[PDB]
Symmetry: C3
Subunit: 226 residues, 3 copies
């Protein structure tokens, strides 16, 4: 990929874009993102039937393609994550001693069907995921249990981000500015090939199924971007 090829497809220039703004949102329309991918790998306890949460994501992205919008979602907890992200980053850099470079959005391949938005790329070649949990209760869960107690959704997110960027390891850092002390804690998550194999199998399928579904109703992927 290049910031050039993205222009052809979407008319948008990516070099002058901020995590959050208008153009950022449009870039993600219809695209399987690391933040939502837990839904794509969700399995039924029996059968081969896609569970509701996976169907709902399926129809969510299809709507994104056919309407060219996404619904605006504000929640207290998300706004908090956004408010404290910058401070988490700086604290993280000071403590780990690495430099972080902010990354717009990264697609896996020419198809542009798969992407992550890293919280940064580090000077040592690892990617970075920051959490600023809205509840101090969740911060504590991670501060004590470490790797053990990363939410599966967060794992799929990190793993997918390696899957997309081809990277080998990823920082996962949790920050709480209400902690008197010990308000930063991070681990390194190694690329895991069970996940990689899972995405190789499951993601191409999910994309095929979305193609078949849009054809039935006379749309084509990419319409969100005209």
């Amino acid at each position: 990929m290049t910031p050039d090829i993205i222009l052809q497809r979407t008319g948008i220039d990516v070099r002058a874009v901020e995590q959050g703004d208008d153009a950022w949102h449009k870039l993600r329309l219809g695209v399987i993102t690391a933040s939502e991918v837990h839904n794509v790998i969700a399995k039924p306890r029996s059968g081969k039937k896609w569970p509701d949460m996976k169907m709902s994501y399926f129809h969510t992205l299809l709507a994104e393609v056919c309407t060219g919008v996404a619904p605006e979602v504000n929640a207290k907890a998300l706004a908090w994550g956004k408010q404290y992200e910058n401070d988490a980053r700086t604290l993280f850099e000071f403590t780990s001693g690495v430099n972080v470079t902010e990354s717009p959005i990264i697609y896996r391949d020419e198809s542009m069907r798969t992407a992550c938005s890293p919280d940064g790329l580090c000077s040592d070649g690892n990617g970075l995921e920051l959490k600023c949990p809205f509840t101090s209760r969740d911060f504590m869960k991670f501060r004590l249990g470490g790797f053990e107690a990363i939410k599966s959704a967060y794992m799929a997110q990190v793993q997918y981000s390696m899957w997309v960027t081809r990277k080998n390891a990823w920082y996962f850092a949790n920050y709480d500015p209400r902690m008197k002390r010990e308000g930063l804690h991070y681990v390194v998550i190694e690329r895991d090939e069970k996940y990689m194999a899972s995405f190789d199998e499951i993601v191409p399928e999910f994309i095929e199924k979305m193609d078949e579904a849009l054809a039935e109703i006379g749309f084509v992927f990419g319409e969100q971007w005209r």
Copy 2:
């Protein structure tokens, strides 16, 4: 069953009412309605103890009788629906096509225990459920899957409205204006006699049980219209 009988029981004039008046809500108080009947017909896995969803609608309805006060409208979904209500109506008229005349509320019999408030009545004898889903996701679920796609709750709602109104078929419509094109989808649902029978045995019991409960606390159905 007529505007006279309703005036005599509730002192309300039905012709003065639109979908959403302070009177629209008053007329529904304590009445088993279409949109809520799925709770009425919920069965346990085994046995005959009423499931939680059924108790919880039971106590909801009883509370309406004894307080005379109504459930909070989710303002967000309704402001949406009210805003495109008319466009959907006209589009479906133009489309199907048929003439859609408004129905405020329809009770099944003089007991006034059972009612629907259809989104209209149609010239060719069909009723009409016409929704503008708050999420395009839901529009897509239905647009692609047809009716097998949708509810436990929607089928029950529609059949119930045929039960109440004696009618033989119903249009189930969705309108999404955010759709770039073909944002109206619809099916015709035929009166299913196995549902009709289900209502005929389950709903009366349910009503006997509310009358038992009201007497236990010295209330009488109808008090909510004083």
Copy 3:
């Protein structure tokens, strides 16, 4: 275990303290409270692995300890309960013919790890849990269903209140201002010695684990009061 034992640790005059004010909340940080205690007595279906809720409540208190804050929970229900506080109480004394004294907070022992904040203390020596349920539906559930319909989380709360205050009986009441009549219902729950033991086996272990956890990260219980 006296009024002054408190001032030495916290610097708080328990006189001034009116349920809701600044001082009230400070006194509850990191302390196992009756409303939450059902999370503490939870047991997993199979192994030993403390259930979600238990772990969740575990982490909530630790964070109270290390942040010295607790976020606002509910608010909706709580603001409703505030508004009807006096009337529920007046109606209750009228009806039961006992007099209600408001207690701010009550610790079980000088360890100060365990507390309840009863809605009152009665002239007959019983305590008083006095709820104004957010929905009339829940009022109705308790009105028709009595003792047996009130949940596990409520019984636990009440029993813990006896466990804390060393009392043999407790009034469990609901008030609903919206009910035309019959707006107040109440029962008497007696001390249950199996609950007492359950609290005796389980609680001190749960406290012992909190202390292990806090050490782990260089925090000490007591710290939040500074």
